[PDB]
From a paper:
IMP-13, a member of subgroup 2, sharing 92.3% amino acid sequence similarity with IMP-2 and 82.5% with IMP-1, was first identified in the Gram-negative pathogen Pseudomonas aeruginosa from clinical samples in Italy and is a common cause of carbapenem resistance, often involved in large outbreaks. Imipenemases represent one of the major groups of class B1 metallo-β-lactamases found in Gram-negative pathogens, and these enzymes can hydrolyze all bicyclic β-lactam antibiotics. The overall protein architecture of the IMP-13 apo structure is consistent with that of the previously published metallo-β-lactamase fold, consisting of a global αβ/βα topology with a shallow active-site cleft at the border of the two β-sheets. The structural information and dynamics presented here reveal important information about the mechanism of antibiotic binding, as well as a significant role for the active-site-covering loop (L1), indicating that the plasticity of the active-site region is important for the broad substrate recognition spectrum of these enzymes.
In complex with each of the hydrolyzed carbapenems, this loop forms a tightly locked, tunnel-like structure around the hydrolyzed antibiotic, with several hydrophobic interactions appearing to stabilize this state. The pyrrolidine ring of meropenem, doripenem, and ertapenem is suitably located to form aromatic, π-alkyl interactions with His197 and is further stabilized by the hydrophobic environment created by Val25 and Val31. In the X-ray structures, the interaction of bound ertapenem and meropenem with the Trp28 side chain occurs via the sulfur adjacent to the β-lactam ring and, additionally, via the methyl group on the pyrroline ring. Compared to the apo structures, the zinc ions in carbapenem-bound IMP-13 are located slightly farther apart, with the distance for the different antibiotics ranging from 3.8 Å (doripenem complex) to 4.2 Å (ertapenem complex), whereas the distance is 3.5 Å for the apo state, presumably to maximize interactions with the ligand. To further understand the role of the L1 loop in antibiotic binding, NMR spectra were acquired for IMP-13 in the apo state and for IMP-13 bound to ertapenem. However, notably lower values were recorded in the L1 loop in the apo state, with values of 0.51 and 0.46 for residues Asn26 and Gly29, respectively, whereas in the ertapenem-bound state, the values did not drop below 0.6 in this region. Most significantly, Trp28 NεHε had a hetNOE of 0.3 in the apo form, which rose to 0.77 in the ertapenem-bound state, comparable to the values for the backbone amides in structured regions of the protein, indicating a significant change in dynamic properties. This suggests that in the apo form the L1 loop is undergoing fast-timescale motions, while binding of antibiotic in the active site stabilizes the L1 loop.
Residue numbers in the entry: 4 to 221
Write the structure that this text describes.
């Protein structure tokens, strides 16, 4: 299995790639972010494992940063795998109320801090967490960095196919995808969970794949 990797994408914006074997899909590549505000670091999604999460936290602790927060974009393992470990290490975890509700019904450890607002400023003028509506899951969020104009689309951005449909809402995805396109047209870069960083066009490609998926449904 490939080692956790961390790459600077921009001043104050890092991508973290982690890997795990999932039945059927094989070795899954999961991209997350780390955002720096002054001396504070914020985790956008955790690696699959407490181990990789520990490795990620130590990387920024070693460089003089303090982890002031972590946001999970939805309730599946590839966003929440490290939450239990982060809690034990006194690092504040965030998730939407919907995400925390789904984690509870799944018997999984919940984030410590939750929020219900469609648009939540995790850090004023720096990290916005946005709920476009159901798609990949009922609770999937995206994260917007207005300074860099980077959108983290998580498992919601699916330009070449929708992937795991287990908890997907095919009827809502296209509406949610078009809502995303409406709000973040000004996006310079779109970082997704499982595909290469692209431009704003990746929001339109997701809409096309959602529409296609919905059609096969009927
Ligand atoms: C462990 C969980 O966290 C799980 C989850 O969150 O549900 C992980 N997330 C997802 C996900 O859908 O976001 C998957 S599957 C992932 C899709 N993205 C990669 C991929 O192979 N994409 C792809 C490419 C071309 C065609 C198609 C097609 O479906 O036809 C799919 C792999 C993971 C196992
Ligand atoms: Zn998922
Ligand atoms: Zn995923």
């Amino acid at each position: 299995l490939p080692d956790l990797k961390i790459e600077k994408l921009e001043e104050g914006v890092f991508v973290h790639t982690s890997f795990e074997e999932v039945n059927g899909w094989g070795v899954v590549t999961k991209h997350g972010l780390v955002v720096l505000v002054n001396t504070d670091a914020y985790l956008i999604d955790t690696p699959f494992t407490a181990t990789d999460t520990e490795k990620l936290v130590n990387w920024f602790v070693e460089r003089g940063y303090e982890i002031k927060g972590t946001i999970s974009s939805h309730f599946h393992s590839d966003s929440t795998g490290g939450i239990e470990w982060l809690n034990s290490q006194s690092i504040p975890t965030y998730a939407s109320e919907l995400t925390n509700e789904l984690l509870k019904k799944s018997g999984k450890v919940q984030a410590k801090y939750s929020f219900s607002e469609v648009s939540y400023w995790l850090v004023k003028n720096k990290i916005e967490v946005f709920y476009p509506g159901p798609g990949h899951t009922q609770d999937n969020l995206v994260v917007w960095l207005p300074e860099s104009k980077i959108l983290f689309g998580g498992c919601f951005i699916k330009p070449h196919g929708l992937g795991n449909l287990g908890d997907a809402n095919l009827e809502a995805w296209p509406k949610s995808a078009k809502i995303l396109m409406s709000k973040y047209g000004k996006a310079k870069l779109v970082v997704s969970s499982h595909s290469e960083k692209g431009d704003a066009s990746l929001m339109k490609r997701t809409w096309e794949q959602a529409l296609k998926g919905l059609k096969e449904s009927k």
